[PDB]
Design a protein around this ligand. Structure first.
Ligand SMILES: O=C(O)CCCC[C@@H]1SC[C@@H]2NC(=O)N[C@@H]21
Ligand SMILES: O=C(O)CCCC[C@@H]1SC[C@@H]2NC(=O)N[C@@H]21
Ligand SMILES: O=C(O)CCCC[C@@H]1SC[C@@H]2NC(=O)N[C@@H]21
Ligand SMILES: O=C(O)CCCC[C@@H]1SC[C@@H]2NC(=O)N[C@@H]21
Lengths: 123, 121, 123, 121
């Protein structure tokens, strides 16, 4: 649900995700990573299922962050694909892909894969 | 500059991707899939490096599509992560993650992974 | 190390992994999954770095299980790629790919991706 | 039966894969990579469906290579998961995970993902 997704979330690495879920299925906010070639906040944009199933299923969503802001440019972008599970302890479970720009030759080693779990902070 | 990312692209499955790249890094557009539980167009939003390195490297980017529109709701979302290479034959080489909303018990098989290559041909 | 890897391991889904690490970098054993179209034990084969780095790095390894035994055939195979971290609480952290045989047409949806963490049981 | 998996295959990077498939599902052989921190041949072991479905589907399989041999030790291992399709032009279509041994702090960037297509050409 939008209200459930909107808020401040943190993951196991200590990164911060601030997001607003719009009525049209949109997600906008900023992301701050605790690791990597990144500093300060970066803009994020994404989409989510604004009409999930009426059962105990998670709400599918995803977002992207290109790691360029006014202070650094890492020449990379990460996309997180996962689901939102609301409740007393709401979590967003994801798997992500991080692609770095490379020459054709090194293209075989351009993408990392991992997974992150986010916990919502009260409010 | 010289990022002919804006345009209509097609992938090996015959899906169509129409995007606009903004000077500061935004990507907006619509996606139409030739396969799956989808029909007509869906809204996409992403980001790209608006200042790629000045060496022979590609431009990293990514975008998301939540598979809900006025015709169907597949309760899933796909994110594509990859890089753009321009020139005579410009291509966008990606790897994607498709997550469906499941119950806890089926969370272990909620995500598919694949790769798509787009061209303007 | 071989001695450290050899043993019985379980993951968060309740699946069992019994393995022997050979001096030549080989892994052989059986796997029993708590979920899926599987029943009883399946043979597994893999390899590991028999000469890791002398630091606090994990030992890279991977193994495969084709889901066919004398009782079922799911027409699929899973490969786990990860690292072994030994110590008092040794763990094997992995990411896996599960490919199902399909017709060319449905090949775009043939592979699932996930991650599993294994805990070693005493002995 | 009719699984011409045994043989010498090559992928788009020019790497060579020589494998033998056993009647009960084992795969054994050697791998030589044209890229990376590797040189000469490495041992591979895997498994495949020795009884694939009798419809027009491919044969699922997978194999592992730990990148250590008498010449180099890259402290990494790659696993390829995919399916074999035979016929005039037989191919093995895969997705792979390459994990390097890291310290805890760098565990978040320990794994690369990619895709390789093999042919006997
Ligand atoms: O190093 C880079 O190229 C940019 C920073 C990447 C940080 C990654 S994105 C996935 C993972 N989750 C995080 O919170 N941070 C890392
Ligand atoms: O079935 C669904 O859940 C919605 C359609 C999914 C279509 C996928 S997304 C990745 C791949 N690339 C495409 O162009 N279409 C498929
Ligand atoms: O359903 C199938 O095709 C065969 C069983 C798959 C079980 C998978 S493999 C990865 C994950 N980890 C487990 O312990 N079980 C599931
Ligand atoms: O650099 C290393 O760690 C060892 C060599 C890795 C080579 C990889 S494995 C996947 C891809 N396919 C190949 O044929 N080679 C690269």
């Amino acid at each position: 649900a939008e209200a459930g997704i909107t808020g401040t979330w943190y993951n196991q690495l200590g990164s911060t995700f601030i997001v607003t879920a719009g009525a049209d299925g949109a997600l906008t906010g900023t992301y701050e990573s605790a690791v990597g070639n990144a500093e300060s906040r970066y803009v994020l944009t994404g989409r989510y299922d604004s009409a999930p199933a009426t059962d105990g299923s998670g709400t599918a969503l995803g977002w992207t962050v290109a790691w360029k802001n006014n202070y650094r440019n890492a020449h990379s972008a990460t996309t997180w694909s996962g689901q939102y599970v609301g409740g007393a302890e709401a979590r967003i479970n994801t798997q992500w892909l991080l692609t770095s720009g490379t020459t054709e030759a090194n293209a075989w080693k351009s993408t990392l894969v991992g997974h992150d779990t986010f916990t919502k902070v009260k409010p």
